[PDB]
């Protein structure tokens, strides 16, 4: 429980316990599970008090930052409110991407019905 903020869950498999952290989950969690003495065997909160050090030193080496680059999606997105399209007037007037804005139950961006 040290990776990004905390990694809350105990006694799961680590290959999906590293999904609760942001930016890594279920398929690059297999990939970033790349270390000797690091294998999922129902020891999430066990089997490692120094072996955990390599598998977040490499995450600090893993260039896409996980949580430190939460500013870049709003850098890109807020950059796209220069009024072109595809974020421009799905947010300045707030309809939804999905190409059919009122014919079906578009409620995933709508408040209610």
């Amino acid at each position: 429980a040290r990776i990004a903020g905390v990694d809350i869950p105990r006694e799961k498999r680590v290959v999906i316990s590293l999904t609760y952290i942001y930016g890594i989950g279920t398929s690059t969690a297999q990939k970033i599970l790349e270390e000797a003495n690091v294998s999922a065997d129902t020891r999430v909160k066990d089997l490692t008090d120094d072996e955990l050090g390599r598998i977040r030193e490499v995450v600090d080496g893993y260039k896409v930052e996980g949580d430190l680059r939460r500013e870049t999606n709003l850098n890109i997105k807020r950059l796209m409110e220069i009024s072109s399209y595809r974020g421009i007037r799905h947010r300045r007037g707030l309809p939804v991407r999905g190409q059919k804005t009122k014919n079906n139950a578009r409620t995933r961006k709508g408040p209610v019905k």
């Binding site: 050090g53 600090d60 260039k63 930052e65 430190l68 680059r69 870049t72 850098n75």
Partner: protein, 74 residues
Amino acid sequence: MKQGIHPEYHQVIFLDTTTNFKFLSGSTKTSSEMMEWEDGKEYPVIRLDISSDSHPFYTGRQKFAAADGRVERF
């Protein structure tokens, strides 16, 4: 520091990966693994922090992502 009502706290050694520069106090207690004498010869169980390895200011992080900059020849 009137008697009785307070929980006890005393020094530790915080075994950081960079010089372990913490001998200050705290309420945490566990098994004294590696005692010292240059620091507080006490409960050494303060485990590890991320104090002096990468500050957002007094260090260097990785570079920024991407400008316009079509350096791929489209």
